[PDB]
Amino acid sequence: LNIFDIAGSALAAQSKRLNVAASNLANADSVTGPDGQPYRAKQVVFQVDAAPGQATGGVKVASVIESQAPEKLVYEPGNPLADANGYVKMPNVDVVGEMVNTMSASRSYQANIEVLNTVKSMMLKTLTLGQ
């Protein structure tokens, strides 16, 4: 019965990673946010979630962090957002990396779905025991 919690945590974590990848793709060409700061790319942090003491368990998303990767600089001095040298900070989104993240998250999502289907069938069949 714990397997439902484990696989549901896995599905939630992969959904969060997919949403972060979609957010990174959407704002690859973004210039500014609601304030004057640029869009720093997001990445989720996966951890092992074992509420009891048995070492292993499901995966949990501890936090969403902004990659410390350097900000791309484009020479646009007429933009009011430019600094003293006339450069504007554009995000450092890795397009190929984010597409690969999307596809890999999708595949892991399906694997967890298949696991859930199989174990649900087994737990339905165990109620038949000797009757």
Binding site: M103, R107, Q110, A111, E114, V115, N117, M122
Partner: peptide
């Protein structure tokens, strides 16, 4: 290569259905 690997994993995920 990426497309081939993705398609292979998609086919392989069917092995978990009992």
């Amino acid at each position: 290569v990426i497309t081939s690997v993705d398609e292979n994993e998609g086919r392989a995920n069917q092995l978990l259905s009992m």
